[PDB]
Design a binder for this molecule. Sequence first.
Ligand SMILES: *C(=O)/C=C/c1ccc(O)c(Br)c1
Length: 126
Amino acid sequence: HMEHVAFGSEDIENTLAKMDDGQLDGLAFGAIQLDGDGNILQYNAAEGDITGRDPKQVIGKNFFKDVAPCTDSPEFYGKFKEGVASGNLNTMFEYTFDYQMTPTKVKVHMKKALSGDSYWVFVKRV
Ligand SMILES: *C(=O)/C=C/c1ccc(O)c(Br)c1
């Protein structure tokens, strides 16, 4: 009932290109797909369990402006938009999520998706 994909795997963008919503919900880690502006295209069940948000409700919201203002910073949004601009986004770092929630530290892996104007944000607890 799970997709046997590890967080941080070198070819994660190839493995996840085949997955619809149900398959994304089979991952062990949170998975968000953003467009280049930060609008949420996809959001899986594991991420909803980490953050408390409803994966169906967040689609179409802007990550940086709307749902995740704590990521509107050089250390998160800044890294994202630099990787969008280069066309080779691939950066991993720890971060704390603290907006209208118990502060929760995560490991974040942002990586360009194979789909046009699409960027993954992968998430697990630390
Ligand atoms: C800080 O504001 C973090 C907010 C947050 C992190 C992760 C997800 O998935 C959401 Br919808 C919000």
